[PDB]
Amino acid sequence: HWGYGKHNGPEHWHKDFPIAKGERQSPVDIDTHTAKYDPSLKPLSVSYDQATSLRILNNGHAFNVEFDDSQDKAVLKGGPLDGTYRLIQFHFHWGSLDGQGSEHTVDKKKYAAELHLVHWNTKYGDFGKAVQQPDGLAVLGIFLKVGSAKPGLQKVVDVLDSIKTKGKSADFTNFDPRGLLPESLDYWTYPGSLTTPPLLECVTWIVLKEPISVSSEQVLKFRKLNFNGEGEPEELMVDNWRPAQPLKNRQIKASFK
Ligand SMILES: CS(=O)(=O)N(Cc1ccc(S(N)(=O)=O)cc1)Cc1cccc(NCC(=O)O)c1
Ligand SMILES: [Zn+2]
């Protein structure tokens, strides 16, 4: 089954998931000179004060921090979005070295990692229905560079030893995702897809311009996770990113001048 190895990685996905070669795949390179300011984008509203984190799971591809999405507790609204999008999980993609790891790129620059906060459009009732719709999901993407530590990340780092291998989970209550945001909410936006199988073309991407800084010790702990299950050969969870896909007939819009 699919993964990030030489034998099962992104260049193979199209054999089981032909939409991999579709018209609105993600991630993309963001050419900053070609993206145009869109003065019509409405202000972006990140409302995470009532967020209820539940659990952290190593799914063999990344780790997901899961939220209660059975009420409007943590929502994304505004920007390019019509209606209300509920936070269901966040996860990261990262590299084996600090010079790669992000999915989106900015003028071909790769960041050390990328955070994805995944939200679904409440007009579709549940996540599984939402992913069947062209406006079903909104993913807020945030770049990570290596420098100063991110204090709000450390609770995540410290639990990773307890979910080293695929299929392990741990309680992860009372985590505040506001501690993972940068100061500015300036962004780029475009219509795209999930970046893993099933690669569904259901995402409005919102990629923040300002990266967050994390320390080398924080990212080193990400790279100690395993893709494998317990009692199986160790394969470090690194380089779990899809490279940039063709932009095709899309325009990237900027929220900022
Ligand atoms: C297997 S998973 O946990 O990785 N997952 C969730 C997901 C993927 C990618 C993003 S991202 N990088 O674009 O923000 C956001 C959410 C993939 C997924 C999404 C939608 C439906 C299914 N259902 C099961 C199936 O069909 O495998 C699975
Ligand atoms: Zn992702």
Question: In the structure encoding, which two tokens stand for residue 204, read together?
Answer: 């409005």
Decide if 197 contacts 188 (C-beta within 8 A).
no
Closest listed residue to residue 2, CA positions, set 152, 227, 164, 251? 227
Query: Is ligand 1 within 6 A of the CB of residue 255?
Result: no
Question: Residue 101, exposed/middle/buried by CB under 10 A (0-12, 13-18, 19+)?
Answer: buried
Closest listed residue to residue 165, CA positions, set 216, 217, 224, 238? 224
Q: How far apart are the first and last CA of the chain?
A: 44
CA 86 to chain centre: 15
Question: Cα(137) to centroid of ligand 2, in Å?
Answer: 12
Query: Is ligand 1 within 6 A of the CB of residue 30?
Result: no
Beta bridge partners of 47: 75
Tell me which residue has its CA closest to atom 27 in ligand 1: 198
The tokens 């991999």 sit on which residue? 20
CB atoms under 10 Å from CB of 41, counted, come to 18
Question: In the structure encoding, which two tokens stand for residue 186, read together?
Answer: 């300036």
Q: Quick check: bond before 198 cis, omega within 30?
A: yes
Q: What residues contact 122, with CB distance under 8 A and at least 6 apart?
A: 72, 83, 84, 85, 86
For residue 38, the domain's CATH number is 3.10.200.10
- Gap between the Cα atoms of 174 and 158, Å rounded: 14
Q: Is the dihedral of CA 133, 134, 138, 142 positive or negative?
A: positive
Decide if 224 contacts 50 (C-beta within 8 A).
no
- Gap between the Cα atoms of 107 and 105, Å rounded: 6
- Each residue of 60-80: b (16+ CB within 10 Å) or e? bbbbbbbbbbeeebbbbbbbb
- Gap between the Cα atoms of 218 and 125, Å rounded: 36
C-alpha count within 13 angstroms, C-beta hemisphere, residue 208: 22
Based on C-alpha coordinates, what's the Rg of the chain?
Answer: 17
- Gap between the Cα atoms of 93 and 165, Å rounded: 16
- Gap between the Cα atoms of 198 and 159, Å rounded: 28
Phi, psi of 224 (to 5 degrees): -90, -10
Resolution attained, angstroms: 1.1
- Look at the chain and report how many structural domains it folds into: 1
How far are the Cα atoms of 76, 91, 214, 235 from residue 169, in angstroms, in the given order?
26, 14, 24, 18
Q: What residue type is 57 in one-letter code?
A: L
Please list all protein residues whose beta carbon sits less than 5 angstroms from ligand 2, which is an ion.
116
Query: Is ligand 1 within 6 A of the CB of residue 144?
Result: no
> Is 195 among the annotated ligand-binding positions?
yes
Beta bridge partners of 77: 45
- Gap between the Cα atoms of 194 and 29, Å rounded: 15
Decide if 99 contacts 112 (C-beta within 8 A).
yes
Domain of residue 117: give its range.
1-257
How far are the Cα atoms of 27, 200, 238 from residue 210, in angstroms, in the given order?
18, 27, 23
- DSSP helix/strand/coil, 117: strand
Question: In the structure encoding, which two tokens stand for residue 166, read together?
Answer: 């695929």
Decide if 117 contacts 46 (C-beta within 8 A).
no
How far is it between the farthest Cα atoms of the chain?
55
Name the method of structure determination: X-ray
CB atoms under 10 Å from CB of 257, counted, come to 6
Planar angle of CA 36, 31, 33, nearest 5 degrees:
50
Active site residues: 61
CA 222 to chain centre: 15
CB atoms under 10 Å from CB of 32, counted, come to 13
